[PDB]
Design a protein around this ligand. Structure first.
Ligand SMILES: Nc1c(O)cccc1[N+](=O)[O-]
Ligand SMILES: Nc1c(O)cccc1[N+](=O)[O-]
Lengths: 214, 207
C-alpha cells in the first residue's frame, strides 16, 4: 500500500502515469499517485519559484521558502523524500526494491539549476531524504526521472502488476521472416541445450554491450 | 532540424512531449499496422520462458512505412548499450530518429536485424532498473537529445534568497564576491560529493 505525491511546476507531465495505473490496484487501495503544482505554494502574484544563485553562475535556483511550505504540507516524519538530481546517488533496481515497501514517497521535481540545498538539508533533520540520479545524461528537470522512478518502484509493489548478465535475443512466430530463421536450437526440445545457448548469448551480449558488468 | 517518430502500443503515454515542445515529434500506435482484428502484437517465445515477445511482422510493416535509409532507429532495451550524455550529443545532429518502444519481454530480435540491413540501428539502455516498457526511456532520450539540438565531477549545492532560512545560512563564501574563493569552495563541494556518491566517475570502485 503506497502513496506517491509528486511536486512539480509541470504537473501535466505526470498525468498520464496517473491514468495508467490499473483500476483494480486503485480500487483495492494498493496505490495512489497524486500530482501537485508547486506554484500552489508561491507567495506572490507572479507565482515565482526561482531566483538568482548566490555566488553567481548560470540559470536560476528554486526558492527554499516555496519548497519548504510545499514539503511541510505534504510530508510527515514517515515520508521518504526523493529528490531526483544529476548529482544524486545512483537509482538502481536495488533502490526500487527498497522503496517498494514504503508507505509514502514524495518526489520533489526540480528545474533550472536545482533546488536550494537547504530544502533537502532541513527536510533531512526530520525525515528520510534520498537524492538520486537515474543516469548520466542531462535533463531539463526532474519530471522524466520521476516518471522512471515511479514506474520502476510501482511495478514491484505487490498487486500493482496484476493477477549480472544481459538478456539475450528473443524470438516468436513466424519461424522464418524476411530471410531470417529462428535459431534452430530453440525449436529442438532440448531444454538443457537451450538454456546453455541462452547463457552463452547472454555472456556474448554482456561482453559486447556492457563490459562494466563483468 | 530534427524529426522524431515514436512507435508504441501506448501512444497516450507519450503526451508528456507534446506539452513540452515549441523539431517535430510524432507518436504512432503500433496496432495501426496489424491486420487481424484482435490487433495482436505478441506471442509466446520460441524456446520457452515467461511472458510474451512482440511479433516481428507488425514491427516490420510499421518501420517500413516510417523509416528511410537515413533514419537512426533507436530501440530502448534493458539489454542495450548505455545511453549517455555522449550518446545525446551524437544524436543531437541527426535528421530523423525513430524510437521503437517495446513492451512485454521485448521485440523479436529479427526486427533490429532486418532494419540494420538498410539503416543504422542503436539498442540502448537508460539505466539498470526495470521498466514495464520503453516509453519512459523514450521520454528521457527525447528530452536529453532535444536540449542539445543546435538552436569528471558532480554539480555542487546551489543557494538563493534569503541568505538565512529556518536558521540555516547560505555558506558565507558565496556572499563574499570573491570569485577565486567561490570557485575553490565549489570545486571542493563537488569533489566531496563525487567521492561520496559517484566514485566511479573518478575511477574508484563502486560500493
Ligand atoms: N540526470 C538528471 C537531470 O539532469 C536532472 C534531474 C534529474 C536527473 N536524474 O535523476 O538523473
Ligand atoms: N531498463 C529498460 C527497461 O526495463 C525496459 C525498456 C527500456 C529500458 N531502458 O532503456 O533502460
Amino acid at each position: 500500500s503506497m502513496k506517491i505525491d509528486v511536486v512539480t511546476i509541470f504537473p501535466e507531465y505526470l498525468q498520464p502515469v496517473r491514468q495508467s495505473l490499473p483500476g483494480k490496484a486503485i480500487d483495492a487501495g494498493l496505490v495512489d499517485v497524486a500530482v501537485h503544482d508547486l506554484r500552489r505554494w508561491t507567495h506572490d502574484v507572479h507565482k515565482s519559484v526561482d531566483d538568482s544563485p548566490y555566488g553567481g553562475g548560470p540559470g536560476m535556483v528554486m526558492k527554499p521558502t516555496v519548497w519548504g511550505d510545499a514539503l511541510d504540507e505534504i510530508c510527515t516524519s514517515e515520508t521518504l523524500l526523493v529528490v531526483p538530481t544529476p548529482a544524486g546517488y545512483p537509482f538502481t533496481q536495488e533502490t526500487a526494491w527498497q522503496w517498494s515497501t514504503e508507505d509514502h514517497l514524495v518526489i520533489a521535481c526540480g528545474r533550472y539549476e536545482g533546488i536550494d540545498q537547504r530544502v533537502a538539508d532541513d527536510a533531512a533533520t526530520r525525515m528520510r531524504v534520498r537524492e538520486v540520479s537515474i543516469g548520466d545524461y542531462v535533463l531539463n528537470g526532474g519530471e522524466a526521472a520521476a516518471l522512471v522512478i515511479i514506474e520502476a518502484v510501482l511495478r514491484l509493489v505487490p498487486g500493482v502488476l496484476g493477477n549480472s548478465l544481459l538478456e539475450g535475443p528473443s524470438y516468436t512466430r513466424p519461424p522464418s521472416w524476411r530471410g531470417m530463421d529462428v535459431p534452430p536450437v530453440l525449436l529442438s526440445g532440448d531444454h538443457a541445450k537451450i538454456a546453455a545457448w541462452r547463457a552463452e548469448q547472454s555472456r556474448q551480449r554482456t561482453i559486447e554491450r556492457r563490459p562494466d558488468l563483468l
